[PDB]
Design a protein around this ligand. Structure first.
Ligand SMILES: CC(C)(COP(=O)(O)OP(=O)(O)OC[C@H]1O[C@@H](n2cnc3c(N)ncnc32)[C@H](O)[C@@H]1OP(=O)(O)O)[C@@H](O)C(=O)NCCC(=O)NCCS
Ligand SMILES: CC(C)(COP(=O)(O)OP(=O)(O)OC[C@H]1O[C@@H](n2cnc3c(N)ncnc32)[C@H](O)[C@@H]1OP(=O)(O)O)[C@@H](O)C(=O)NCCC(=O)NCCS
Lengths: 790, 798
């Protein structure tokens, strides 16, 4: 009979409920629950939502693949079917769209026992199938089932409304908000926009934004932080509408894609309606009418007293922000820092960010760490109350704990040489239990506090992957200094790889083996044993102390071989080995090489190269967002094939520096070009045979003539790309060229950069640049004369 | 003595400038007598004298500039100008120092101390040290003779000696401010439309003022207005008042377009004047922002006005059009002096104010193409113009004399024969610049064709036309009724062998002989300077007679003429015009040729001009890497060998230029269109000595065996082209070097290979240049890969 009490409690406290129904029918329980919810609620039709994977009272039928379109909607309850289709990211997107007093219902199957641990038939499990490791053990399902007995609103029933023993163990906010609205009722476009707010926290950033807009000063960059469902686009839209009514003419909205917000402009129209604006003769909107989002509004024109416009602009587009009066930045945390700095200027800035949910990051965010330096204004506001349910919802806490979307960590010197590396048993890490879930939360806390976004699908990757291993660094459960996730790759095939080099298939894993072999046409690379470092992360409080390098070094020797191995519910688990195992008690796989795929970064490039990695691949097309190119590095473990791959990559990079790598800084390109792990077997010089074939005798005369009556460099600009090409190929001896001279030669020759363009990058005067360039010419001319036997 | 008084009195009573020429060593001391007479005649005290000096010579308010700071006085208005140091006096500052004189002026030129009016054969021009070619070192100076002879054609050009005595040469010699006043009275009580009109000085100025503001008053963002000036009627003042009116009308986004901030120097001055008429207080209602840079001087860039909302007026470059997304009003100054593609990109869905100059030393004829496409249409084409001067009454004799002397008139336009029946004649420069009758009209017609073919066209070319020692005139006549085409050719070459070596060892060139010096410096060939050549300085055809090959026939006839296919089978005296000269037009059979060895031309690169010059038979030899200021064009030098009058050296120069162009296509020529670069690469006037195939040694040395395997794999699979993007620049380089055979590549395929390889252009960037979809571009690119792969297979013994 406890079903009724749970329904009444949820509807009387604005708290969602969670029901898990086990049964083949799945039709005699949804209607009963729907009737109970209708009786318990004031309304009649809660507009329930039903979702499927690919196939099967205002009910709309949605599909799992097409989910981003439903992010902005609100329903009374959620129904989930076809359990072997969900993903951790998907589970956090459908439950967040349920109003207070929800009736979220999940129908797994018609089991009669614990047939969920080994019944993993997820679509995502087909992409973990590696030919080397075809055995996959479901582990996420075990944690999901065991998490239903830790919350007070997670009742589990069957198709016959029978309570299982597992689940058998189990207003005030709207007080100051209405008072504030009444106080600001008489206020001219100040309180009317506040009336459109739904939460007291929402009508505090809006008031702050309105107060900043009211003061006609262009020095304010107040930033707002959200928590994925507490209201951030609505506050921004009301602020933009208030700015329009305040006489602002230049208002810009910054977002990576038009599809991101989809709500900011909706509330702008709502705010305009609160201002008694008719959007047919006082203002007009312009839609994309192009393959950008679906029907996102790009430009809005308002003509009441003067002409004002609201235009969507790209985060990288800052040229059109000259006469801008107000700029709105959405998800500035995920926006690259250099883009943020360029966007900011002497005008009003409205910043929005998320530090919770399945987005954003924390760990002393650099957003409010460097901007807190000044005439500039640094107001800050935040939200902590949801707009769809009462704070402290059991379902939200259950989702956050299961999905590890919490525990910002931060709360915590030892010498790096005294640290020890310990292997983590994934079998005992995802079995809930006690003192192990906290370790999992701490590990995931380090996971998400290192990089923006960090989609929760990695949690399933962390548990259900067949060839993934976890290593942690511990001081001499103690605090985890660093965590490393390594994926085993290689030992695939030779005949299938040969067919895969043709118009074949790239399987579903082994990114490094399927990329290096494809790019270098070497079928023998896939037969080697390798390990890919998928994720590495040190604690934010001890970055730069050497813990990451020591952890990488310890992993290298462990893989080399320097650590010889000398009804009727049930309890979660009692067996399984301890959580942490010493490196001396676990045999190694005897890997032949170590690889890593990451996004190119001058600081990351230095760290990886110092570890002993050699670049092997660099993607030409920039990756979407963050403006970075994918880079693949390899390191031999003990050479033959690495040297050949390194030489081939260096030759390709020289010619590819003119297509898409021209935007690279000369220092970054020079660092990629030169490595200390690989030697230079190019001792033989250019010789007179190649010098005459490559350069005409008149061309050599012009180069020699330039070195004695030094004149404008445009006469010999046709020879610079050839000279740079044959110098970086180690065919021009040594020439004792300095770092500045080498960078200048690379930029002018390979990148075809002008001297004025290189002025900012090199940060040297034009006279010094002329002298360095002229000195290179004399050195090349002198060496050429020596080659030609005087 | 007396006649000076009436002339001064008549000039001050009619708002017409005067002109006095004083001759004698006692000059510069009798100016006070004229100054005293002017002060009594006029109703002012200080006429703001404008004394000038050559470069260092030395209750009255002179402004002391000599010749360099002429742009500093370009905006100020004076009441009397004193011109000294006749030595330099190039025909470009005379139009700048007299136009800045108010009505009833006393423009005085002190000339020199000639005791018998020595005329042209004395007092050499201090510009003559710019045409002293080492081959031709004999200048005449016909400009001085023409200037002296033109002093007896106007009624207010009296010439006096050092003793205030009229020379025998010169001894032979209101209603406008009515409608403007009533217009101001009718608009006295009007809102800012009516108060800004009172700031105008002429009725013509306050007729375009009530066209910009009228368009401003109507809140419609689809309208453009074109205004034409004549260098002294007032155009920036009207633009400034219109901008000020727009600011008072609630406009928030106003942009001003000009090549340089110093071009106007008065638009913002009248904007502040209009703001003062609007009762706007500085530092309380608006603020200004300066450039604070050595270049562009201390002009005004951005002006911010905060009365009710925030409005700004920002100067923008013609190239910069991205920032015009939210523009409401855009003002384009000197639109006729801006490239057409830049003007079209600047225009958009807002209010456009177009300003241009037709007469004076700014803007020329045949510029109606700007006001010929905008008339296609939702958008309007309101037309305004000015015809009355600011400082002096219209119809001034001094203005007419200056215009006639500098040929700043005769807009031409007023005028079928087959080109094959046309005849080419030579023009004697001695009898062309001697004034006379029926010859000055020909000079005006020739200058009419000269100006109406190219913008700017500074009058200094007239001195180069006459005073140059090695310049010749050629015209095409129908079978002097009318000049179908005119050609100006400069002779160059025969400099030295050791002088070139000394110049090459230092790198300084010299004055004159642009083509011989550039080719020698760029190719290190001292033997080129000893050859005989002729540089086509300018070729012009009638605008109504362009398109039927009149220029081509004139160029062809000139070629055979040079080849040798036309065998020769204080005065106390009256100067009077000289008539002892040969006929004005001489047949080509009565003038011996110079027997030149080659024909050259230096011009700015243009796809239509490139096709025309290449069709004539010219071969590119040089192309300037950096873009020239304005018009976005690169200087190009073409050469053509003269058969039967001299080709070995040209072939070597052409091969060297082609090799350099391939490597230079990635530095500054990457912005060139693929069609334009391909046209420059391939020429029909020179045969192609392509080497048959390439040896296997070169293939292995340039391409690694694994690289060839990757290329073969791509051709068999058509997978991703990014895998072989490192080989495309090398493949393109060897294909255009005549080392890849023929390959039967089409024009589209060749353009695609050039853009991707040599120019390093992405496929998406080439979508709008080839006008072919990316799907077809992939097929063409893939087909080239198969052809290259197949050819490489045969190279390595199948
Ligand atoms: C990358 C990371 C594991 C390095 O850990 P670490 O213990 O600080 O490394 P070290 O102590 O050896 O520091 C030495 C070098 O690391 C580099 N580096 C250091 N901290 C970095 C940071 N937050 N971000 C990027 N690179 C960093 C630096 O270039 C440094 O060289 P330097 O002293 O000349 O400046 C960690 O700091 C980090 O930033 N993780 C998030 C980004 C990431 O995971 N990249 C890997 C992608 S697979
Ligand atoms: C001579 C000139 C007028 C064009 O030659 P033309 O005798 O009128 O016409 P032609 O039949 O000989 O062919 C010339 C080609 O250039 C084109 N062209 C035509 N008018 C032109 C013009 N004002 N300016 C530039 N190119 C022009 C023509 O269309 C023609 O191309 P087409 O074969 O596709 O029709 C052109 O060279 C010119 O002089 N323009 C004025 C600017 C100038 O001084 N140019 C010379 C630079 S030194």
């Amino acid at each position: 009979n406890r079903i009724r009490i749970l329904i009444e409690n949820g509807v009387a406290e604005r708290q969602r409920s969670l029901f898990v129904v086990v049964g083949d029918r799945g039709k005699d329980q949804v209607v009963i629950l729907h009737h109970m919810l209708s009786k318990a609620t004031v309304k009649a039709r809660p507009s329930v939502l039903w979702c499927y994977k690919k196939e099967l009272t205002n009910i709309r039928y949605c599909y799992y693949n097409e989910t981003h379109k439903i992010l902005g909607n609100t329903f009374g309850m959620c129904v989930l079917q076809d359990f072997e289709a969900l993903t951790p990211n998907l589970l956090a997107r459908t439950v967040e769209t349920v109003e207070g007093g929800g009736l979220v219902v999940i129908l797994l199957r018609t089991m009669n026992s614990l047939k969920q641990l080994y019944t993993v038939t997820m679509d995502v499990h087909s992409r973990y199938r590696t030919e080397a490791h075809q055995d996959v053990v479901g582990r996420f399902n075990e944690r999901f089932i065991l998490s239903l007995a830790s919350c007070k609103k997670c009742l589990v029933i069957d198709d016959q409304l029978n309570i299982l023993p597992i689940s058998s163990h189990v207003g005030p906010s709207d007080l100051e908000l209405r008072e504030l609205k009444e106080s600001l009722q008489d206020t001219q476009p100040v309180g009317v926009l506040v009336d459109c707010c739904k939460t007291l926290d929402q009508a505090k950033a809006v008031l702050k934004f309105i107060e900043g807009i009211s003061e006609k000063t262009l020095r304010s960059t107040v930033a707002l932080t959200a928590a994925r469902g507490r209201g951030k686009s609505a506050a921004l839209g009301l602020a933009i509408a208030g700015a329009v009514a305040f006489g602002y003419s230049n208002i810009f909205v910054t977002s990576p894609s038009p599809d991101n917000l989809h709500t900011l402009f909706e509330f702008v129209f709502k705010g305009f309606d609160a201002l008694q604006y008719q959007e047919h003769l006082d203002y007009e909107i312009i839609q994309s009418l192009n393959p950008e989002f679906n029907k996102a509004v790009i430009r809005v024109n308002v003509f009441r007293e003067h002409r004002q416009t609201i235009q969507y602009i790209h985060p990288a587009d800052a040229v059109k922000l000259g006469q801008a009066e107000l700029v709105v930045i959405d998800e500035a945390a995920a926006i690259p820092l250099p883009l943020v700095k360029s966007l900011l200027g002497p005008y009003l800035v409205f910043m929005a960010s998320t530090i919770n949910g399945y987005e954003g990051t924390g760990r002393s965010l650099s957003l409010k760490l460097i901007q807190q330096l000044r005439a500039r204004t640094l107001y800050e506001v935040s939200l902590q109350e949801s707009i769809r349910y009462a704070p402290g919802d059991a379902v939200e806490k259950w989702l956050n704990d299961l999905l590890c979307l919490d525990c910002l960590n931060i709360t915590r010197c030892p010498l790096p040489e005294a640290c020890e590396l310990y292997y983590v048993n994934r079998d005992t890490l995802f079995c809930y239990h006690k003192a192990s879930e906290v370790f999992l939360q701490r590990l995931m806390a380090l996971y998400v506090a290192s990089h923006y976004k960090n989609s929760p699908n990695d949690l399933q990757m962390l548990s259900d992957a067949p060839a993934h291993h976890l290593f942690c660094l511990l001081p001499p459960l103690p605090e985890v200094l660093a965590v490393i996730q390594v994926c085993l790759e290689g030992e695939i095939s030779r005949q299938s790889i040969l067919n895969s080099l043709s118009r074949g298939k790239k399987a579903s894993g082994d990114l490094i083996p399927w990329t290096v072999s494809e790019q270098f046409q070497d079928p023998d690379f896939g037969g080697l044993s390798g390990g890919r470092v998928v994720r590495i992360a040190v604690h934010p409080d001890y970055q730069g102390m050497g813990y990451g390098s020591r952890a990488l070094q310890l992993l290298q020797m462990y893989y080399e071989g320097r650590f010889p191995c000398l009804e009727e519910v049930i309890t979660p688990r009692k067996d399984l080995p301890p959580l942490l195992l010493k490196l001396n008690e676990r045999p190694a796989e005897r890997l032949d090489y170590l690889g890593v795929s990451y996004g190119l970064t001058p600081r990351l490039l230095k760290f990886w190269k110092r570890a002993g990695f050699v670049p092997v691949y660099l993607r030409q097309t920039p990756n979407d967002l963050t403006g970075e190119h994918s880079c693949i590095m390899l390191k031999t473990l003990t050479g033959g094939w690495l040297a050949a791959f390194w030489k081939d990559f260096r030759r390709r990079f020289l010619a590819l520096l003119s297509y898409q790598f021209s935007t690279f800084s000369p220092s970054l390109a020079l660092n990629i070009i030169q490595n200390r792990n690989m030697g230079k077997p190019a001792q033989p010089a250019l010789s007179r045979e190649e010098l005459e074939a490559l350069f005409l005798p008149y061309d050599l005369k012009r180069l020699e003539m330039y070195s004695r009556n030094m004149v404008d460099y445009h006469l010999i600009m046709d020879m610079i790309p050839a000279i740079s090409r044959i110098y970086f190929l180690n065919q021009l001896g040594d020439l004792a060229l300095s770092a500045a001279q080498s960078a200048l030669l690379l930029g002018i020759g390979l990148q075809h950069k002008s001297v004025d363009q290189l002025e900012k990058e090199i940060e040297l005067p034009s006279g010094q640049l002329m002298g360095l360039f002229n000195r290179i010419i004399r050195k090349v001319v002198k060496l050429f004369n020596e080659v030609q036997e005087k």
